[PDB]
Design a protein around this ligand. Structure first.
Ligand SMILES: CCCCCCCCCCCCCCCCC[C@@H](O)O[C@H](CO[C@H](O)CCCCCCCCCCCCCCC)COP(=O)(O)OCC[N+](C)(C)C
Ligand SMILES: CCCCCCCC/C=C\CCCCCCCC(=O)OC[C@H](COP(=O)(O)OCCN)OC(=O)CCCCCCC/C=C\CCCCCCCC
Ligand code: SF4
Ligand code: SF4
Ligand code: SF4
Lengths: 258, 70, 156, 176, 97, 318, 18, 114
């Protein structure tokens, strides 16, 4: 009943992307990226639009950068919700799921509102951003964001102390902090083993120069620490939303360069 | 809301309610209100042994009183 | 008390029965897995319609095929479809597997989901909004309700 | 910046020791979480009563396509054909031929929802604002051949919804 | 204050008029403005939620085949064009024509 | 007319497991905020029969690889014993006055899981065998502590007969006397019945519906049904055994009216457990038992052996 | 269905002999 | 009698449910549909030997506790014996050994369960 070696066989969903991308012009390639890490649909677009703007040597008007970070962060919350949740569902917690996807649905109400699609919002553009966001939105984001924290907190009351959950995930599956680096682990899988590194603080790309937030380092490198990193990073993103709401300059959003 | 659970749960109760009644009265229905008789030990059965034969009827539900001796 | 009358009654009974609590199993292969889940999310709650995601085809009937299909994957799909009990159904979903959709032209996709299994209702979208899906399955019930093997069997 | 999740460690003070021991034996946090779900039993359920009620959407929302007319009653489409030229799925196929009047027109504008990805590039692309990604979002159907809309079908969709679509575009275009 | 609530169940029981049918099809209950138009029947509402506001009610005679209590009502049954825009909160502030 | 009494015991309970299913989806629904089944009811009520009809109507294939005899005989045994355990249960008046029917409750409960072993053995599938095996592990592992703590709570009622267990609770309730054993009895009923945190037999995401998989329509309905039989039944058992009540012989019905409350009050709790905790995994599931529950069950056991002598409080029954 | 009429409109032999 | 009657009615009930379960749907079984489930892809081989010492290493201990509880059962009745001091030691005694047995397993690392 012990495993002796797990033998993953990916490619069961190799839709074949990179070959397709080559035949289609830049603007027509963008949607593929939503179709990639689909749980985190905005950040992929942002990754691309940066990737072109460097080649194209062109800089978005600042407001666009503030949106790009803002939805970068709401998406940060989406992936973390989905991650912590379904990771719980895999070990049978069942409930927290339903408590959260209400919220996650309220976030899709925002993608719904600005992009016109509930998700896969081809909205970030190489030039900056697509349509400007509707006037009625920001207060609406405010009203939600102020109340979300109780929800995440209550989640945490069902999990972090729930010592059954602790015992199931606390001594697994530790990875050596250097050995991570040899395998090129990234993001949270690094921080769980306590190494300081993080790209937003390290090589900031947008207004992250102008936002302030605390990166949560793990320690033991067990799944549990990674979990707390997920939660805490949720709270921190929830910190970012405040700052972006409080400094959101008027101006254009697409680049002037027609 | 949550109160709306109740139609679902009350139907439970009544169902479970039924056997508890249905047996308890059948006893009285058969035993003539004597409310059944347990016989865990040989002796108590010996009392039901002495009975039935004492009643002219074999059904021992009836307990002939003092009048029986005269 | 015509025999046909009674047959109409039993027809109504079993077809209403099967249509009233079908139990999907799900290949949430690609990214339309998540929208499936929002059907089961509290805000729309598939369960109130009685439908409940239960794994293992042998305990399930209707099959959702969310998300893009691929070549290596296909044979497993045909396996799972074969192992379902009659009266099995399926449901193609999204522009995903209605016919490759976005990925219509690649070596690894298998165009439509149609080319390996006999699909029932289609639910176009990319992703379809979970609610459009909901209209999908309700439409599926309004197709089961028109099923009538009993009326026909007596007729033959 | 960097923060230590965990790292904090329990006190060995005897009051605290007896507290953790009593916690283990008497399951405090367990009953805490259990009390929490008790608490969520009493909140009002979030479900909408679909069909009878339907979820909130947005003016910008994307759905079924539909070519649409001038108020004059004339159709808008003029076969600049770049809807074909910008759709990533290339769902669209167009074959224009001249009107007897000599105006440009389509002969068999068509589209197939089987390949369309509802990205809304067509919605952006049209110079005369002919094709429009309609508000309708439900048209799930029995048979694959129905998905592959003909031109006439799109017009009929444009007829069914025109007040509605014109309402959305009216409510939205300034942001464009 | 349970008595006032049960009393609300009573007032709803009277105002709904034969609520047993509406709960036999439309699944209850409280109703509201009863604004209407459309190809047939239809309905409207207002209450206390961003999602529970603005209900609907299928035409008893429907577009053709009879649709009523214990009948298979369509979701596509709702009046085309105008009413969904008020019904999806695309413009709930903008009352149906 | 004893036969109609039996029939009167068997029909209502099956109705009860059906509506138990529905309540399960209901409450377990409202914990999730989402409403449970509703549309078909009006209050969902008509659902379970539609459900069962959906099952029995549906084709139940005889697997090509499976041996057929075991494959059929197992479900039969499952419902069999699931129902048979109900007979000697004082409500207030037992259908049968077994001199020692508690011990019999243990007997039925102990033959129960054997059906699981066949259920996974004849099913032939890999998941079937592995899941069935771990299932039998957890089960037996809990029946030992089970029966010991039940013993220790029975030293003081007097004897194994059940009706007396009413008499011994004409005031204080057993629970105030020995609640910790009531805890362990509770959890052992929470695992023996294979429920929420102790979830493994079904396996679920861990093993895609466990042993039960290869069973299709009707037999699946039987294992499902029998499972709920055991859940309500151990619940009722705990109810009579740890929660006494006033009992006027002239109005037995009154007592039952109370009893179904006190037991239903338990069954709901399992559901409200199900909505709350992630499952243990097969190591820890047995770890907490052999390492942690058991020694307390023993120490408590000697303690309860020893109270009646020190307190000079030895129970009456011969 | 198919839209935009025909293609080659190929000619056919005359009814009249020779 | 009494109990045999309820046994018969229960078993006949269940068997009745079986027969109405099979001889009813009346549809088409066929090969590959009847092939064993294996999460899609076909099995690499029929079920063989999931061997583990860690099964019996504890399960046997189950069996030797169950024999013990079999001796514990007489206790409630034995409690009413005329001479408890003659009894009481033994009432404790076995439990000690039960515990003792466990204790011996506890720390020879023979109890690795799983
Ligand atoms: C005169 C003196 C006589 C005696 C007086 C003193 C009484 C003795 C002390 C009473 C203790 C009895 C409690 C029962 C044993 C508890 C041990 C159990 O919890 O084991 C733990 C395992 O815990 C259990 O598995 C909990 C899971 C049970 C899930 C069901 C939740 C129950 C909800 C509450 C229901 C209460 C209803 C009845 C109340 C009256 C293993 O501990 P460990 O390995 O070190 O780390 C985990 C610690 N935990 C507890 C935080 C998880
Ligand atoms: C696959 C097929 C599935 C079929 C499942 C069938 C499983 C049934 C096995 C259950 C056998 C257990 C029966 C024991 C009943 C019992 O202990 O009764 C208690 C009761 C206590 O009475 P006291 O209080 O001590 O005395 C005074 C009371 N007035 O005992 C009695 O008095 C009644 C004695 C009557 C004897 C009847 C015993 C019946 C045994 C039948 C076994 C047949 C096994 C065949 C199974 C075939 C499966 C393949
Ligand atoms: S539908 Fe949209 S999301 Fe689902 S697969 Fe096709 S493209 Fe990816
Ligand atoms: S843009 Fe709209 S109108 Fe102009 S050609 Fe393409 S489709 Fe016809
Ligand atoms: S819908 Fe989106 S994808 Fe399909 S054609 Fe119009 S624009 Fe191109």
């Amino acid at each position: 009943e012990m495993v002796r070696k797990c033998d993953p066989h990916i490619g069961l969903l190799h839709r074949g992307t990179e070959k397709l991308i080559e035949y289609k012009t830049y603007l027509q390639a963008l949607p593929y990226f939503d179709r990639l890490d689909y749980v985190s649909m905005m950040c992929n677009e942002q990754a691309y639009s940066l990737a072109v703007e460097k080649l194209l040597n062109i800089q978005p008007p600042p407001r666009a950068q503030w949106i790009r970070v803002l939805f970068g962060e709401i998406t940060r919350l989406l992936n973390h919700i989905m991650a912590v949740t379904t990771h719980a569902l895999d070990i049978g917690a069942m409930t927290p799921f339903f408590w959260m996807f209400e919220e996650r649905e309220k976030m899709f109400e925002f993608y719904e509102r600005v992009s016109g699609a509930r998700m896969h919002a081809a909205y970030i553009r190489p030039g900056g951003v697509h349509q400007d966001l509707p006037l009625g939105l920001l207060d609406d984001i405010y009203e939600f964001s102020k109340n979300f924290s109780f929800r995440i907190d209550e989640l945490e009351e069902m999990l972090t102390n729930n010592r059954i959950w602790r015992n199931r995930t606390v001594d697994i599956g530790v990875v050596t902090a250097e050995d991570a680096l040899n395998y090129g682990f990234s993001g949270v899988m690094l921080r769980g083993s306590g190494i300081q590194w993080d790209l937003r603080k390290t090589q900031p790309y947008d207004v992250y120069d102008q936002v302030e937030f605390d990166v949560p380092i793990g320690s033991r490198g067990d799944c549990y620490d990674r979990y707390l990193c997920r939660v805490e990073e949720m709270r921190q993103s929830l910190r970012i939303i405040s700052q972006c709401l409080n400094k959101m300059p008027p101006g254009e959003i697409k680049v002037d360069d027609a | 809301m949550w109160f709306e659970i109740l139609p679902g749960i009350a139907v439970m109760a009544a169902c479970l309610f039924i056997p508890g009644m249905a047996t308890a009265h059948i006893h009285k229905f058969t035993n003539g209100g004597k409310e059944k008789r347990v016989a865990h030990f040989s002796y108590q059965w010996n009392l039901m042994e002495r009975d039935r034969r004492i009643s002219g009827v074999n059904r021992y539900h009836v307990t002939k009183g003092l009048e029986n001796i005269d | 008390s015509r025999g046909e009358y009674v047959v109409a009654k039993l027809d109504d009974l079993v077809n209403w029965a099967r249509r009233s609590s079908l139990w999907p199993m799900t290949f949430g292969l690609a990214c339309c897995a998540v929208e499936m889940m929002h059907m089961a999310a509290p805000r729309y709650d598939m369960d109130r319609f009685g439908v409940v995601f239960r794994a293992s085809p042998r305990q399930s009937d209707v099959m959702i095929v969310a998300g893009t299909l691929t070549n290596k994957m296909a044979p497993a799909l045909r396996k799972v479809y074969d192992q379902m009990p009659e009266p099995r159904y399926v449901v193609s979903m999204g522009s995903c597997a209605n016919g490759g959709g976005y990925y219509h032209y690649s070596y690894s996709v298998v165009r439509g989901c149609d080319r390996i299994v006999p699909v029932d209702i289609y639910v176009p979208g990319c992703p379809p909004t979970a609610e459009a899906l909901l209209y999908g399955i309700l439409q599926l019930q309004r197709k089961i309700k028109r099923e009538k093997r009993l009326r026909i069997w007596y007729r033959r | 910046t960097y923060k230590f999740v965990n790292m904090r460690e329990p006190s060995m003070d005897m009051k605290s020791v007896t507290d953790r021991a009593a916690q283990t034996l008497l399951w405090t946090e367990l009953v805490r979480g259990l009390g929490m779900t008790l608490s969520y039993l009493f909140r009002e359920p979030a479900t909408i009563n679909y069909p009878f009620e339907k979820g909130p959407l947005s003016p910008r929302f994307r759905g079924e396509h539909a070519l649409r007319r001038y108020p004059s009653g004339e159709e808008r489409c003029i076969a600049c054909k770049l809807c074909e030229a910008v759709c990533p799925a290339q769902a669209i196929t167009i074959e224009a031929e001249p009107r007897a009047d000599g105006s440009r027109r389509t002969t068999r504008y068509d589209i197939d929802m089987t390949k369309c990805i509802y990205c809304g590039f067509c919605q952006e692309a049209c110079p005369v604002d002919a094709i429009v990604e309609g508000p309708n979002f439900e048209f799930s159907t029995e048979t694959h051949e129905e998905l592959l809309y003909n031109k006439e079908k799109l017009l009929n969709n444009g007829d069914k919804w025109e007040a509605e679509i014109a309402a959305n575009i009216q409510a939205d275009y300034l942001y464009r | 204050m349970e008595l006032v609530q049960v009393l609300r169940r009573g007032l709803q029981q009277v105002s709904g008029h034969g609520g047993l049918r509406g709960y036999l099809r439309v699944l209850f209950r409280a109703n509201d403005v009863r604004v209407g138009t459309l190809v047939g029947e239809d309905k409207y509402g207002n209450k206390y939620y961003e999602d529970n506001k603005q209900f609907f009610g299928r035409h008893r005679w429907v577009i053709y085949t009879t649709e009523m209590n214990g009948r298979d009502t369509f979701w596509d049954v709702d009046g085309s064009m105008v009413p969904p825009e008020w019904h999806r909160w695309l413009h709930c502030m903008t009352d149906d024509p | 007319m004893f036969m109609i009494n039996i029939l009167s015991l068997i029909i209502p309970i099956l109705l009860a497991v059906a509506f138990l299913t529905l309540v399960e989806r209901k409450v377990l629904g409202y914990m999730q905020l989402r409403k449970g089944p509703n549309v078909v009811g009006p209050y969902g009520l008509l659902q379970p029969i539609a459900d069962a009809l959906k099952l029995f109507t549906k084709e139940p294939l005889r697997p090509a690889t499976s041996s057929i005899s075991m494959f059929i005989i197992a479900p039969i045994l499952a419902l069999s014993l699931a129902l048979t355990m109900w007979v000697p249960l004082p409500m207030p008046y037992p259908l049968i006055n077994m001199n020692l029917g508690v011990l019999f409750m243990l007997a039925m409960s102990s033959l129960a899981v054997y059906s699981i072993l066949w259920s996974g053995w004849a099913s032939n599938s890999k998941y079937a065998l592995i899941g069935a095996l771990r299932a039998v592990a957890q089960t037996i592992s809990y029946e030992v502590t089970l029966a010991i703590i039940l013993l220790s709570v029975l030293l003081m009622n007097g004897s194994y007969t059940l009706s007396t267990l009413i008499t011994t609770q004409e005031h204080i309730w057993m629970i105030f006397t020995s609640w910790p054993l009531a805890m362990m009895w509770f959890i052992s009923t929470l695992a023996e019945t294979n429920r929420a945190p102790f979830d493994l037999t079904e396996g679920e995401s861990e093993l895609v519906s466990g042993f039960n998989v290869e069973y299709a329509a009707g037999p699946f309905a039987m294992f499902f049904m029998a499972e709920y039989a055991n859940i309500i039944m151990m619940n009722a058992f705990t109810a009579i055994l740890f929660l006494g009540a006033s009992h006027d012989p002239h109005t037995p019905e009154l007592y039952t009216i109370n009893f179904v409350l006190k037991t239903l009050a338990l069954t709901i709790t399992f559901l409200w457990i199900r909505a709350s905790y992630p499952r243990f995994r097969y190591d820890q599931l047995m770890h907490l038992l052999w390492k942690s529950f058991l020694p307390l069950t023993l120490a408590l056991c000697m303690w309860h052996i020893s109270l009646p002598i020190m307190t000079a409080s030895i129970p009456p029954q011969s | 269905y198919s839209t935009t009429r025909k293609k080659i409109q190929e000619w056919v032999p005359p009814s009249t002999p020779y | 009698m009494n109990i045999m009657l309820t046994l018969l009615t229960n078993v006949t009930l269940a068997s009745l449910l079986v027969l109405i379960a099979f001889w009813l749907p009346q549809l088409n079984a066929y090969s590959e549909k009847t092939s064993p489930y294996e999460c899609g892809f076909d099995p690499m081989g029929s079920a063989r030997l999931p061997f583990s010492m860690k099964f019996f290493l504890v399960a046997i201990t189950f069996l030797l506790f169950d024999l013990e509880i079999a001796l514990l059962l007489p206790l409630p009745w034995a409690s009413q014996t005329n001479n408890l001091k003659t009894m009481l030691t033994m009432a404790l005694f076995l439990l000690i050994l039960l515990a003792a047995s466990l204790a011996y397993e506890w720390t020879q690392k023979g109890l690795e369960w799983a």
